[PDB]
Every structure is written in structure tokens, then in C-alpha cells.
Ligand binder design. Structure first.
Ligand SMILES: [Cl-]
Ligand SMILES: [Cl-]
Ligand SMILES: [Cl-]
Length: 162
């Protein structure tokens, strides 16, 4: 298992524009296109992202390309963020993947706000962090995903993705 396979499990693959769990236009492996309610605005973002007139449909290779960029962006986002970098650097590789997964889903700013959770993780108080992480809109709106990510933080194993 690795961060790419983990996110493929959590995000799926869809080759036509769809709405994500928040109702936002998305394509591929959870590539958010726009928060605009305009499908035309989403189609424009898509064409700009892929470099061609897609008519709202892409290939698997194209979806994987955007996914690679998106994972890269989440990691670089963590490393540039004063609140996330220390926590990331304190973690082992498996738990690092759980943090990348959160940032991929919610964005750098949204995760960096989990101040109390981040502290517990930095302290390696795993059970306490797991309890604190679940007291969140995140957990309540996407509980099965959040449970998987939290299990990964709590255990430092990939058991939740087996
Ligand atoms: Cl995403
Ligand atoms: Cl708590
Ligand atoms: Cl979920």
C-alpha cells in the first residue's frame, strides 16, 4: 500500500464530470474542478487542466496525470505550511500518508486548523488524537473515509485499507 493506492481507494475513478460529496464539480480521482454551480465553468477548468477540449470527458491516463499532480501538491502544501510541516516531519511514513490524505480531501488550510489533533499527533498520543479527529465536520460528513484515515493515524498500519 502507498499514498496513491490509498487515495485511489478513497476517491475512486470517474472519467466524466461528477459532483463530489460536497456537491462540487469534480473529475477523475477526486480532482476538484470548481466550487461554482456552473457546469460550463467546470468544463472550462477541465479543458485548461488537461490542455484540450474535453467536452467533460477524459481518459484514465489523463485522470492519473491530474492525480499525480494533486498528490504532489498536497505534499508540497504540507511542507510549505508552518503548522503542518512539523507534524508531518514527526510522523512515520504510514501516518504521513494519512495526513496527505486529509490535505488531498480538505486542503492545506482546512487541515492546518485541526490544531488540537495536530498537537496530539506530534505528541504521539495516538488514541487521544484518534478521538479528537473524530469530533469534526469531516468525520460526521464522511465517516467511513474518516474512520479509515483515523485508523491509519491510530495504528500506523494499513489495516483499514486491507
Ligand atoms: Cl481532492
Ligand atoms: Cl478530544
Ligand atoms: Cl465516507
Amino acid at each position: 500500500m502507498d499514498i496513491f493506492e490509498m487515495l485511489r481507494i478513497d476517491e475512486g475513478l470517474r472519467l466524466k464530470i461528477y459532483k463530489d460529496t460536497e456537491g462540487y464539480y469534480t473529475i477523475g480521482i477526486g480532482h476538484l474542478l470548481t466550487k461554482s454551480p456552473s457546469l460550463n465553468a467546470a468544463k472550462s477548468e477541465l479543458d485548461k487542466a488537461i490542455g484540450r477540449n474535453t467536452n467533460g470527458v477524459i481518459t484514465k491516463d489523463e485522470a492519473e496525470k491530474l492525480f499525480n499532480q494533486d498528490v504532489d501538491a498536497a505534499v508540497r502544501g504540507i511542507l510549505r505550511n508552518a503548522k503542518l510541516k512539523p507534524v508531518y516531519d514527526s510522523l512515520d511514513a504510514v501516518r504521513r500518508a494519512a495526513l496527505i490524505n486529509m490535505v488531498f480531501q480538505m486542503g492545506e488550510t482546512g487541515v492546518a486548523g485541526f490544531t488540537n489533533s495536530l498537537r496530539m499527533l506530534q505528541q504521539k498520543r495516538w488514541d487521544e488524537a484518534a478521538v479528537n479527529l473524530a469530533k469534526s465536520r469531516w468525520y460526521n460528513q464522511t465517516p467511513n473515509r474518516a474512520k479509515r484515515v483515523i485508523t491509519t493515524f491510530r495504528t500506523g498500519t494499513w489495516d483499514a485499507y486491507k
